[PDB]
Every structure is written in structure tokens, then in C-alpha cells.
Symmetry: C2
Subunit: 811 residues, 2 copies
């Protein structure tokens, strides 16, 4: 049980329920919502609100009085406050609407007076004149003050204050100078945070919520002898027959109205078999500005829950300003009927704008798929509509996949369909794929490339299609160096012997290649020679060569009769969480771009890299490939469809250098291998804008990235460290909760000395870094020096910002 409500005898949206059954569409063009879904949308910051109050007698908090809502974030908290109130500074029109608190300067500490609905020099006498404070009605409390404030303990019982609204009329009641007498009994420490001003007005009549939602009318049942309007608020699942109206009237479900004569602003009451069958309400000279139920004609009555007739009642109803509360399952049946054809008309919307239900939230993915009979082969069909937003096309195909996996049947084929659609989604699409006869080298030379290695301070999986979806992200990361060499360095050379040898080190015997076979493209054997395969995907076709005539390929290209032999080197395993695979591939491509020709750009290097990273079939951790190639920023992932990829600009480091020296940084612990990653990129691509609060948390990762760059763009190194630890929290506790408790033992000690950290990139193995004050940092090096030392060793490794990172072709 929670907030039951007040009397609130103004709004016609008060069918005899609580506050959960007046369904209203979303701002992103879906009709599956009300306060109840919006109450959930506010409950998520409200269940976020809990921190360090009590054990099980803490709270599960009573909801508000619903000044409307969903502007920016609460907290609105310090963990030693009983109560934190809300402040709002707007034009004094909303002062004249509802009550404003005001006190001494400074006001948001401890209230001294107020004025409910202020007008002129009275409002000026709210000294100081501009210390306004408008609450909206969700407060914390201590473990004590329940027994005084709301439900005051008397000798009879713990009776409420006789104000039925506890919150608003207590703040009206106790908000004056009796607070300076009264709140000193129950732990006087109180702070107040005010609020911004987005979507804050009230729920007076239906036009309030209409103006909030800007527009109306979605099911849409259009029977006949009706009247076309727009402004009128019809929600879902109301069969609208045979009645002529003017707008402002709202009609839910368990309501099949036929042949009436109605005007503006209509409550229409449910819970009953209401037709023009047995209620006998046909010749209905219905007045204006009143609330059904029963009022066939007359002037300005008051009849509540369904009083019964046949026809006789049509006479004494011009007796105005009288009160007859017409009352002393079928509403749940209204809800059940309303939720019956919801997925049906969602399929209709998946026909209508064909993503208006699908790629708007798809939020009820599993319950949409299973319940009730939603056949997502229609989603496969409209996925293959012609071609769409392949976003939306693949979204529908993945809805089909989500059904076929989720119901029972062909999850592997559902995954295959989603995989191929995912590829096809990224198959778009680039210049050219070309034909170019590379030449340069020339013979005697050796081309050696090299590259530093990113980490990502913040701006985490705002990369990785599905992004937001499209669009964009932003990461701002860095691009730094392990002590020397950068590492990740690639050598590539001509030879004599027309078989393209891929040659690796730390693993590599060789890869003798000329077949292609396809080309290259191999997720076939994951000898990371796989990555140079794709490095031959320059295009890697052309006229007019052939399979034997790699002879022609080389031996007109290079011409330099190589069968080129290309020899990489990574220093670190791919269990880094440093994107080393991606960076490595990119670096090879830069070497090719030098190597025999084709003349490209850093950016389009990374473009074509990402392009082949598609067919590399790893989830495109893509932040890195701009990161570790370039220098210490990234920033701005922006467009992400389909997939467009700028993202650039810069930042000073400079507090990673000129160095801080308030440490003067951060540095390394593996003791932990990776798992490696086989669930992580799943949770990424499960899903797109399908699910869930993922998408939510993703969005403020982006926000926190802009937080990051502004922070260190000012140089708040101490706050840089805060935001680092925040990002850690923002992924550890968030997606993805995989960080394996040995990591947490390395966190455990220390956590202390001084400040935060993160795992870069992947998480679940690899290695951290962390910032401290200053040489206590070196004593932390002494700490990890002391213990916690498996043979994955436990080092200072630095990191070492040092960067440009490219190639030589020397000499």
C-alpha cells in the first residue's frame, strides 16, 4: 500500500480509482503509459533517493500530490536531513496558483514563514523579495519523526494531523515561524535544495495534462455518427460511436457510448455494463462542463458513481448546485479490455509509421512478445518492409528475434536473424569499396607502425552500436603509452615469394596466405591473424584480378614480388580491456595506407576500420580506435547512424602532465585475467532501444561524459577523481555487474588512500588505475607491493601520457 490520494474534487480524470488508470501517451509517441508508468518513471529517482536512513523500518515512500513533473534530477538530499523541501523560482503566476514558502536570507536552510497564493506587496513582503520556494511534495524523514509530524501520537492513538494531505497542509501548517518553535524537538538539521523549471504545472482540469502532453487522441476507435476533432483527449481503447461532441472530454474503457449529445470536459464513469442498452440513456440533452455519470439533461448537478435510471430522471436536474454522491472489478475489466488490443494496435502502429510502436521504446519486449498473441513475424515482414531505418528495420527484425528467442522457438535462428540484420545494418556503407593498385613501398624499405593505448576515463559504453541507438555517444577518453614502446607495433615488408605471410609474435608461427580464400574475413580460426585478414580488406577487391592472380594483385601492385609479409607485435593480451585488438587493426591499416599506397586519413582510416570491425563481428568498442591512435581526448560521438562517425575535438592534459603533482597519476593492477567478455557485448546488443533503464543509464553516461570534459577542462583534478569513481560506480553497480570479487578485494583495501578509480574498458579482469592525493599514492604502491600479488604481477606500469602514434617507412 502507498499514496491513496486526497479528495481533489476538480479534475474530471477521477474515475473511481486511485491514480493509475487515466492512460496518457508518451512524449516519444507511444500510448502505453500513465502515472503508474509515470509513477514508475518518478519512482526510479525515488528508489534512487534511499541512502543511509535506517534498517527495514527505513521507508517505502508515499507518493506526492502531483504538481506535474519529470523535470531534472532529485537529491535534494543530505543523509543527515529529516526533511528536504523543494524550491522553485518562476513567474509569480504560479505563486498565485499555489503556495510559496519564504524565509530569511539564505532561505534553503530552515524555513521561517511562507505565503500560500501570494499577491502584490504582500508577496514583496516575503523578505527578502526573491527568496521563493515552491515544494512539490516528496520529503524524507528520520527514524523518529513519523510519530510527531504526520500521524501525531496522542493519548487516544497516533492520530494524523487533521489535515488530510499530510505533506502540503503540514508545510502550510508548520512552515511558518512555528517551525522555529517545533522542529527543534526532532533533530533540527534540515537542508533544502531548490529545483530547475522544466515541466512544472498542476492538474486542475484535463487541459493541464493536455498542455503537458501537447497533444491527444490515440487509440483510435472511429465508429460512425461521430465528430472529427483533435484537441479532445481520447486515450486508448474506447469504442466511440454515434455521439457528437466538442473537445476537452476524456473517455477510457468499459464505455461503449452510443447516441448522446455531449459538450466539453467530461468525466465518463466506468465499472458497469454501460451501453444505450440497459442504462436507457438516449434522448440526452446533456449540459456543458459537468461530469458523467448520470446527467441526461439539466443544469449543473453533482452525481457520482453509477446511480441508476430508466428515463424518468430527466426532469429535476436544472436544480443547480446540489450535491448527490451517487454511490454510498469491471474497472479491472476495463483495464483488461484496454490491455487486450493494445499489442494489436501496436501492430497497427508497427504498420502505421512502422516504428511508432516499434522503435519508439519497444519497452515491454518480453511481455510484448509473449503476451498475448503478438506475432512478430509481422515484425520480420515490416523489418523487410523495403528498407527503412535499418535501425527500425533491424529493430523489428530483432523484435522478431526477441519473440522467437523469448517465446521458445528458434533463439539461435533468432540470434542468427538478428546477427545478419545487425551486420546488414552495419553493412551500410562506405566509399567505395575500391579497386586501388597500391605501389609505394619501395623495395628496400621497412615500414614500421606503432600506437599508444587508450583508456576511457568516463564516457563508457555510450560507444558500441546500439548506442543511444544512434545517436551518438561521447566518451572522451585519452590516448596513452606504456613506458616504451607505444606498444602495438607493426612491421610490414615486401619479399620475393608470392604468398602473403602474416607473421605474429607472442603467438605467431606464420600465416602463409594466398588463396584468398574469400577475402579475409576470417572469424575462422581465431589466430589473431584474423585481424590482418581484414587488414587486407582494403576493399580488398578490384578489377580485374583473380585468385591465382594475386600474382597480378601483388605483381602489378607492389609490384615488388612479395606476397607481402606483414609482421605485427602486441605487447598486451586482448584481455586488457584496452581495445587492443581494434587499435591494432587500425594501426595496420595506417601502415597499409603508408605502405604500398592509397593515401588516406586518420579519420577515414578509423572509418574503414570500423567498417571492417563490423565483419570482424566483435561488438564495436569503437571509442578506442579513435582514442589510442590520436592523443588525449576524443570527444563527441554524435550521429551514430548509419553509422555516422565524426566525433572530434580536444582538451588539455595538462594535469596529466606539467604534472599535477598531486599524484601524477594512476597505474595498473592485474592480478586478474579476464573472463573475457562473452556476456558483456551481449548485454550491450541486448538491446537496442528495446530495453531498458539501460537506455536511461546510458544517457547519463553521456551526460557524465560532458560532466567529465567540462570538469577537467577547468582543471578540477579533485573532481576529475570524483567523476572517475562515479564512472566506476556507473558501470560496476550498473551495467555491467561482472566485476569479480577478487577485483573487489583489490578495491577493498584500498578504497582509501585517497580517492577513486575504475576499470577501463571491459572490466571483469585486465587492470585498473586509480588516483590518490599525492605520495600516499606511492604508499599505495607500497600497499599493492605488500600483498595481493599473484604472478599476474602487481605493478606500477605507467601511463605515461605520450602520444602521437603512427608509423615510419624508414628510411
Amino acid at each position: 500500500l502507498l499514496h491513496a490520494g486526497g479528495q481533489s474534487r476538480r479534475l474530471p480524470g477521477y474515475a473511481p480509482s486511485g491514480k493509475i488508470l487515466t492512460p496518457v501517451p508518451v512524449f516519444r509517441w507511444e500510448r502505453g503509459q500513465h502515472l503508474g508508468q509515470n509513477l514508475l518513471s518518478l519512482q526510479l529517482p525515488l528508489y534512487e533517493k534511499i541512502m543511509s536512513l535506517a534498517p527495514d523500518k527505513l521507508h517505502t515512500l508515499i507518493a506526492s500530490g502531483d504538481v506535474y513533473i519529470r523535470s531534472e534530477k532529485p537529491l535534494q538530499s543530505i543523509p543527515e536531513a529529516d526533511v528536504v523541501c523543494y524550491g522553485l523560482w518562476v513567474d509569480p503566476s504560479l505563486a498565485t496558483h499555489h503556495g510559496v514558502f519564504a524565509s530569511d536570507r539564505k532561505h534553503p536552510e530552515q524555513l521561517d514563514f511562507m505565503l500560500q497564493k501570494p499577491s502584490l506587496a504582500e508577496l514583496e513582503s516575503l523578505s527578502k523579495t526573491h527568496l521563493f520556494l515552491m515544494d512539490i511534495g516528496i520529503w524524507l524523514l528520520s527514524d523518529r519523526a513519523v510519530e510527531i509530524l504526520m500521524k501525531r501520537s496522542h493519548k487516544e492513538s497516533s492520530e494524523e494531523l487533521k489535515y488530510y494531505d499530510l505533506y502540503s497542509d503540514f508545510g502550510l501548517a508548520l512552515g511558518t515561524h512555528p517551525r522555529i518553535e517545533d522542529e527543534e524537538v526532532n533533530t533540527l538539521s534540515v537542508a533544502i535544495l531548490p529545483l530547475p523549471g522544466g515541466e512544472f504545472y498542476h492538474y486542475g482540469t484535463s487541459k493541464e495534462l493536455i498542455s503537458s502532453t501537447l497533444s491527444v487522441q490515440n487509440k483510435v476507435y472511429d465508429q460512425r455518427r461521430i465528430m472529427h476533432r483533435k484537441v479532445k483527449p481520447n486515450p486508448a481503447m474506447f469504442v466511440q460511436n454515434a455521439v457528437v461532441r466538442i473537445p476537452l472530454c476524456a473517455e477510457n474503457a468499459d464505455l461503449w457510448i452510443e447516441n448522446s449529445h455531449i459538450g466539453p470536459k467530461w468525466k465518463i464513469a466506468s465499472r458497469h455494463i454501460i451501453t444505450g442498452v440497459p442504462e436507457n440513456d438516449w434522448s440526452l440533452a446533456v449540459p456543458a462542463g459537468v461530469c458523467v455519470d448520470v446527467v441526461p439533461m439539466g443544469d449543473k448537478g453533482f452525481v457520482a458513481r453509477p446511480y441508476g435510471l430508466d428515463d424518468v430522471f430527466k426532469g429535476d436536474l436544472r436544480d443547480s448546485k446540489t450535491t448527490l454522491t451517487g454511490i454510498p472489478s469491471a474497472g479491472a475489466n476495463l483495464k483488461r479490455l484496454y490491455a487486450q488490443r493494445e499489442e494489436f494496435r501496436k501492430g497497427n502502429w508497427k504498420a502505421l509509421a512502422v516504428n511508432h510502436e516499434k522503435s519508439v521504446f519497444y519497452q515491454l519486449d518480453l511481455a510484448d512478445a509473449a503476451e498475448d498473441f503478438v506475432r512478430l513475424g509481422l515484425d520480420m515482414p515490416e523489418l523487410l518492409p523495403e528498407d527503412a531505418l535499418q535501425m527500425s528495420r533491424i529493430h523489428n527484425r530483432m523484435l522478431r528475434a526477441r519473440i522467437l528467442k523469448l517465446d521458445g522457438k528458434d533463439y539461435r535462428p533468432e540470434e542468427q536473424a538478428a546477427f545478419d540484420l545487425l551486420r546488414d545494418g552495419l553493412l551500410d556503407g562506405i566509399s567505395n569499396r575500391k579497386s586501388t593498385p597500391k605501389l609505394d613501398v619501395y623495395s628496400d624499405q621497412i615500414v614500421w607502425g606503432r600506437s599508444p593505448v587508450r583508456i576511457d576515463m568516463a564516457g563508457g559504453w555510450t560507444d558500441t552500436p546500439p548506442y543511444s541507438l544512434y545517436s551518438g555517444g561521447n566518451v572522451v577518453n585519452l590516448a596513452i603509452e606504456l613506458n616504451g614502446q607505444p606498444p602495438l607495433q607493426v612491421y610490414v615488408k615486401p619479399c620475393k615469394d608470392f604468398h602473403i605471410v602474416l607473421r605474429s609474435i607472442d603467438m605467431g608461427a606464420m600465416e602463409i596466405v594466398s588463396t584468398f580464400d574469400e577475402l579475409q574475413d576470417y572469424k575462422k580460426i581465431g589466430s589473431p591473424f584474423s585481424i590482418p585478414k581484414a587488414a587486407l580488406s582494403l576493399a580488398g577487391f578490384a578489377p580485374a584480378f583473380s585468385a591465382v592472380s594475386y600474382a597480378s594483385l601483388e605483381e602489378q601492385l607492389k609490384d615488388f614480388g612479395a606476397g607481402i609479409e606483414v609482421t605485427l607485435l602486441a605487447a598486451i593480451p586482448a584481455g586488457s580491456g584496452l581495445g587492443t585488438s581494434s587499435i591494432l587493426a587500425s594501426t595496420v591499416l595506417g601502415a597499409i595506407n603508408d605502405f604500398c599506397g592509397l593515401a588516406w586519413d586518420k579519420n577515414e582510416i578509423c572509418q574503414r576500420t570500423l567498417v571492417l570491425e563490423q565483419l570482424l563481428t566483435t561488438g564495436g568498442g569503437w571509442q578506442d580506435q579513435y582514442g589510442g591512435v590520436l592523443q588525449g581526448v576524443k570527444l563527441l560521438q554524435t550521429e551514430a547512424g548509419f553509422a555516422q562517425s565524426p566525433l572530434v575535438r580536444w582538451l588539455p592534459d595538462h594535469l596529466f602532465t606539467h604534472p599535477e603533482y598531486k599524484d601524477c597519476h594512476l597505474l595498473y593492477y592485474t592480478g586478474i585475467t579476464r573472463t573475457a567478455k562473452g556476456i558483456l557485448a551481449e548485454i550491450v546488443s541486448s538491446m537496442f532501444l528495446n530495453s531498458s533503464l539501460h537506455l536511461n543509464l546510458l544517457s547519463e553516461m553521456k551526460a557524465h561524459a560532458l560532466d567529465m570534459n567540462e570538469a577537467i577542462q577547468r582543471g578540477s583534478f579533485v573532481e576529475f577523481g570524483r567523476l572517475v569513481g562515479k564512472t566506476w560506480e556507473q558501470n560496476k553497480a550498473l551495467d555491467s555487474g561482472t566485476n569479480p570479487p577478487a577485483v573487489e578485494a583489490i578495491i577493498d583495501l584500498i578504497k582509501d588512500y585517497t580517492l577513486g578509480y575504475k576499470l577501463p574498458g571491459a572490466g571483469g579482469g585486465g587492470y585498473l588505475y586509480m588516483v590518490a592525493k599525492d605520495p600516499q599514492a606511492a604508499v599505495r604502491i607500497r600497499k599493492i607491493l605488500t600483498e595481493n600479488a599473484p604472478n599476474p604481477r602487481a605493478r606500477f606500469v605507467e601511463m605515461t601520457l605520450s602520444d602521437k602514434g603512427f608509423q615510419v617507412s624508414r628510411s
Copy 2:
């Protein structure tokens, strides 16, 4: 002679004039404006538009058809185009309003078709569907195409195209595929730039300009038997007597209406002695939606310019939809009467909100002062109202100063009043002024400070109160170093001998001081020992010391019986245009902050520095004192009242280092001493938001600063150089045009090899720097090596970014 106009028989704001006499208030709350003042506001980008067309037969361009206006900047030009059209992409409501051009992809090159007022699948058949283009009607032309396009040469004469509007109906006419036949005769090269979408709608009725201006009603003549409204458009200088109305009607001047019965949307015609005297128009059953003049009663006639009556005409006027153009000095008298009491009611507004006329533009400063009898002793009085915006207070005091200087009388006292008010304006105001007994040193030590030297790449005199005014600026500058030492370095020491010796080098014998006398504070003898005087202005008072008891000051403070002896060093004269004075002072204060105590911050160092820079009485070139102390950015001057001063955040340099090496920078020529500056800071502080297009150009200096930081925040070094040369243009050709032609000979050669430059800071002496491609740069060093070498030598000096810049107190 210019744009006379079209027929345009819709808008009631068409009293028989051109387009200059329907006065409308400004967005910044003054009523002294119309298109004519707004035509000037558009004329300034229009006279900006001229570049490289012709000699004296170039143009002085015909004005537009007035889709309304004053969104963002034109150009909208390449200097080889005949005609550049305007593009606009909005909702197709304004497509249904007025004509849209559309062509192939890409559209903004050479037009192929159009559709005037498009509707549905017709508008979709503007292939490609979203290639819209809405012109607003000011084009260039070649030196040729006058004789074809507008006023086509025939055998009779050079007759116009029979379209009376040349522009709009020619673009309707020639904008189709007949352009692909026709515009190939007259230098076919044409490009098009589209536009943004701020304030673009039309002038259909009065509500259009009302919605544009959002609000109405300023003179305000309120006679009796009238009706209170708001929405009605009454401009200035209309005595409104004895008539009852509904809104939407507009009334100018030479109009003293009494006792009529009028409704909405009224043209009211001038040029005549119109009272209820001799026109005899009293019993006036005036209809709705028609245009005075003459219509006493009736239904929907058409009577133009003043047809004459007595009473008899009141009968055959229900003869609707008839045309009787009532026509086949006193309007200039209306303008003269309207401009008579304008300064009177400006004084009333200078009483009303007391800056609503004053510190809103004060734009007509000299003509406001002189014409006609505006006595600005009222501006002195309301300057001393109590205390105000001392912005507005000092603005009014300076309006008084502007009058007293400008009329004749007491310019020096007017300057004195403005000077004292300027001080008093900056006298506000800081913590504390304190009392602190500094202690630290200790004895044996020597405290040595040091500092690098700013230049300002862009973001020029957006510093320097008056800023915008208040608020703010932004400069982003750098903070760099001459080869070594930083210079500007200060030594300060205890001694034995209780007389505070200021000791300088390159000039300094000594300054033996203990008197104070005041304290310190000396614009008295400009031995730059003056600057250390203010450096003793710590506060520089306290309890409970006295004049002899600097004995107490020192000899309890330090205690260390010094009479402290403080010894600076500048390397460069104050004729640098590098703010060296200000930086120097600040550095001393940092040394004091170390020196004997008081424990401050960089920022509040600079705060208190600026505070004393007030009493230093130089115009506060203030950018520098944050600049050259800190490192290579500044950025964000923001608040500038009263005067608030954050301003911080950062940027990478990084293309001033890791160096470019596409030169890998810029460096020095004096051959020129300064004048020095005695007119420059005048033109700054002449004026505040008084005058002129200064304020305009100032604003886009700020814009160009954000341009700057974004540019090099991405690393567009080539465009960095563009924006440098732009800033040069933006001050040389702009405020202030003082750069003395020897400088321009050093510009002359080179200008060339490759790119631009500026004088930092002051200008009019000192030394530049300039960027080139790369080693052609060194050949420029060879160029200045070759010639142009006075004994103010002609060097490479670098610059040398190298920076933190503070102090030692070693050991």
C-alpha cells in the same frame, strides 16, 4: 533614392508614406525605431555586403520586400556571383504562405524550378522533396545584368519587366527551367547560401509585427473617455482622447482623435488638421476591419487619402466592396511633432524605470544631449537616485557628462564626474579591505617572483569595462614566455631600516617610502614605483597603526625590522601592448601573498589586483592579468558586473607545442614605438552602452572568441590562422584605426608568406607576430632580416609557450 515599394494593399500600417514612418519599439525596451532605423540595422550588413564588384557604378542596393527580418548574418556571397539567393527550411505552413524554390540535388547552386505556395504531393514533387529554398529579396548583380534582368533594354527604352516587384516576381518568373535557358547569357556563375530560422515571417496585418515585437503600447498618451487595453498597437506620440475601442488598431501622429466608436484593425490617416474640429466626424458608427480615412459608418468600403465631408457622407456606405481611392508636409509635421516630445518622454522613462530610456541603448547620445532641450542634470539626479545599477547610475551620470561635454560647457568637469562615477562604479567592492598582520618571511630569505607574458590571439577588447557592459566578454588568450627569463620578475626582502624602499631596474634609483602618505595610490609621479604603491594596498590599512607606526606596521608585522625593500624587474617597456604593467603588479601581489603572509588565491590575487587597478586609473585591460599569470587559455569573461570576475577554463596547446611544425610559431617585430595609448582607452570608455556600433562589433568579438576556442579546440591550425587575421581585421579596420602606416609597411611586405597576424593588445606600436605555412616562415625571418630594420630591432624573439609562472621564497 532607394526602394520605393510595391502596391501592398493588405497591411493597415500603410499611411501614405514609404516604409519609414510606422514607429515600432525595440526588443531592448526603447520606442525610438522603425524600419528606417531597422532598415539601418539591416543596412549595416547590407553596406557590409559590398566586396569587389565594380567602380562607382557598383550599386547602392535596393531594399527588400520585407519578409521580416534580423536573423543571423548574410554573406550569402561569393565575389564572382551575379545573384545569390536565400534559402529557408521551415514547416511547410510558410510554404503555403509564400513561394518556395526547388531544384535538383544539390539545390543551392543553379535553380531549375519552384512552386509558389505549395500544397501536398505537389510539394512532394519538388524533387528532391526536402530541397526547399525561400528567398527574402536582396541579391547582388554583375556590372552587366541590370540591362536585362530588372529593367530590360527594349527598342523603346530600357523598360522594366512588367512585374512591378522586380525581385520577387522575377524569381517567380525566371526561377523555373527558363533560368537554364536564360541566365546563360549574363555570366552563369551563381551560388546560393541558405539561412537560419530566427525571426522570419511576413507583414500581412498589424498582428504580424505585433507578434514580431511580442508586445505594444508605448508613448503613452492616456486622455479620458478612453478604453484600457494592452494588445492594441499604439506607438509614440498619439494623443488618445474620448474614443472607445477593441485592440488591433494603430495610430501614429498628426492625429488627435476625439469621440468616435471604433473597433479592430485601423489604419488612421494623417497629413491633415484632423480633430473633431473641422472634419465634423463625431456620430461615428464606425464598422470593423476597415481603414480610416473616411468611413463614419457603413459596411466595408475603400476610401484612401483624406476625402472631405461635413456629415452628409454617413449614408451610402453600406454599399460594400466598392473602390474609391480618396485622393487623385503635415506628415513631416507628424514626424516633427512625434520627435518633439520623444526626449521628454525619454526623460519620463529615465524617471520611470530610470534606465528604460537610459541604459537600454542611449543610442542617440549626442543628438539626445543637444537636441532639443534634454537637460541631463536630471540624468545627474537619477544617477544619484539613491544607488542603482551603478551601471545605470554612472550611465546617467555619464549621460550628464556627455551632455555637459557635448553641449559646450564643463567637459573637464563632465569628464571628472564621469571619472569619479567610473571609480565609484568600480569602487564596489570587495572583501575586505582587511587588517592582516603579515609575518612569514622569515629573515634570511629572499622571495623572488616571476611571470610569463600574455598575448591575446582573439577576444580583444571584450575585456575592459565598459564591456558589453557588464556582461561579460571573453578573450581566450594564452600565457607565454620570452626566451628566458619569464621575465617580469620581482624580488622583495626584509632589511634593517624602517623605510619601505621601492627599488626598480631599467629606471629605478630608489623610492624611499614611509609616509605613507595616503596610502599608495599614486598616480602621482608616474615613476612606475606607482605600481608598488598599490602593491602596498593590501588593504593596506588595519587597526590600530598610524603614520609613524609603520614602525608598528612592520615592526609587529614582519617584525623583522625592514621598512621592506622590494625590487622588481621588467624586461620590456610598457609600450608593449602586452599588459606588462598589470601583470607586473599582479605578480608583486603574489609575492606579497607569499611574502609576509595573508594566504591568497591566484584568482583572488587577480581580483584584488583588478580592484586596485581601478585606483591605478588605467583602463582595466584585464584579460592579461588572468592571462599571463596562469597558462595558455583564459577563457570566459562572463559576468562583468559589478564587476564579477570568474572566467576560467582551459584548452590544449598542443599546436603551440608538440610543435606544429607547420610553423611552429610566430614572433615579433618592433621597429615601432608606441604612441602610446592616450586615445585608445578613451574610445573604450567612450563609451558604455551609449554608443555605438562599437557595441555591435564588440559583441561579435566575443562571438569570434568562441569561434577561436572551438577552432583550436579542434586543432584547425590553418583556421586558427584565419581567425587571427580576422581579429586583426576586427580591430585594425575596426576600433581602433590607429595602426600607424609604418606598421602597415611591415605588413605590406609581407602579407604574403603565407598567412596572417595581429598586433596583440594595444596596437599603435609594440610588436606583432604572425603565422606562415612552415619554413617560408624562416624565409620571412630572412625578409625582416633583409630590410625594414630600425634599431628597434627587428627580431625573432620567441614565444616559447612556457608556463606556470609564480615565485620561489627560496630557500
